[PDB]
């Protein structure tokens, strides 16, 4: 049985990592009903968008949502993890970020307080994540210049 959207937000990181598809779905099934415009097709043409800037304003909100999706898919793309929800990398874990052991992290902490504890070094980790790939780019570069 599945706890529902964001159900494991108070669960251990391992339990939420088991239901990450659940959190992944609310990125799409909020935006499937709005792009549908099936219940919007007939109601006063296109919900009277003439002299109603809330209609455009509403539309701009829909744009922000798909724009955020594109930000996350871009990050998964430049880290070579586009197709997968869980991917391992080559970046070693610098201990200065967090000193907690594996058992304490995955069976004693929630993703919220973890993201709060590591929000300080997120940019650095992303930099290593954008950098580390670059050594794969370079190995492919060796295969390119023969």
């Amino acid at each position, epitope marked *: 049985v599945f706890l529902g959207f964001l159900g494991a937000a108070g669960s251990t990181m391992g339990a939420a990592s088991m239901t990450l598809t659940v959190q992944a779905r609310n990125l799409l099934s909020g935006i499937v009903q709005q792009q549908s415009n099936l219940l919007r097709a007939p109601e006063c043409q296109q919900h009277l968008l003439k002299d109603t800037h809330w209609g455009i304003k509403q539309l701009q909100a829909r744009v922000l949502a798909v724009e955020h999706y594109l930000r996350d898919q871009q990050l998964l793309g430049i880290w070579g993890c586009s197709g997968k929800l869980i991917c391992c990398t080559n970046v070693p874990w610098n201990s200065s970020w967090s000193n907690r052991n594996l*058992s304490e992290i995955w*069976d*004693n*902490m929630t993703w919220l*307080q973890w993201d709060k504890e590591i929000s300080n070094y997120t940019q650095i980790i992303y930099g290593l994540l954008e950098e580390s790939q670059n050594q794969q780019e370079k190995n492919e570069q060796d295969l390119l210049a023969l």
Partner: nanobody
Framework: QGQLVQSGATTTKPGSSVKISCKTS????????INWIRQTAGRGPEWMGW????????????????RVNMTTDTEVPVTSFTSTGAAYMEIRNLTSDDTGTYFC????????????????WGQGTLLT
């Protein structure tokens, strides 16, 4: 980061019932279990039981199975990841051999095999 405060000590003659209060802070009271353990003077200290503040499920040693009643007060929220609560411990029949030091402790991890294992202890109390 958490703290476990324990009630004041008191000496009562055998035959009557008593109550120990263990007040919590500095963590999420519903996250970690609550254990009660006694240090016997003259023999080896013995674990007594544990209870979940959230699930409410309780499991005691057979040495105190039908002689102990545990209760957990509903946690009081403090921070986004810190709450405060109260844990209560009870004994039905008192005797002279019940004399010894008592402690309340919290759990180490939230899941896994070492879930209810005592980690952070209280200052302790003395008896008759």
């Amino acid at each position: 980061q958490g703290q476990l405060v324990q009630s004041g000590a008191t000496t009562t003659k055998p035959g009557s019932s008593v109550k120990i209060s263990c007040k919590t802070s500095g963590y999420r009271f519903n996250f970690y279990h609550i254990n009660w353990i006694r240090q016997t003077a003259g023999r080896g200290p013995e674990w007594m039981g544990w209870i979940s503040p959230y699930s409410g499920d309780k499991n005691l040693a057979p040495a105190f199975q039908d002689r102990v009643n545990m209760t957990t007060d509903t946690e009081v929220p403090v921070t986004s990841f810190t709450s405060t609560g109260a844990a209560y411990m009870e004994i039905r029949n008192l005797t002279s051999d019940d004399t010894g030091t008592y402690f309340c402790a919290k759990g180490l991890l939230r899941d896994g095999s070492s879930t209810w294992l005592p980690y952070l202890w209280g200052q302790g109390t003395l008896l008759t």
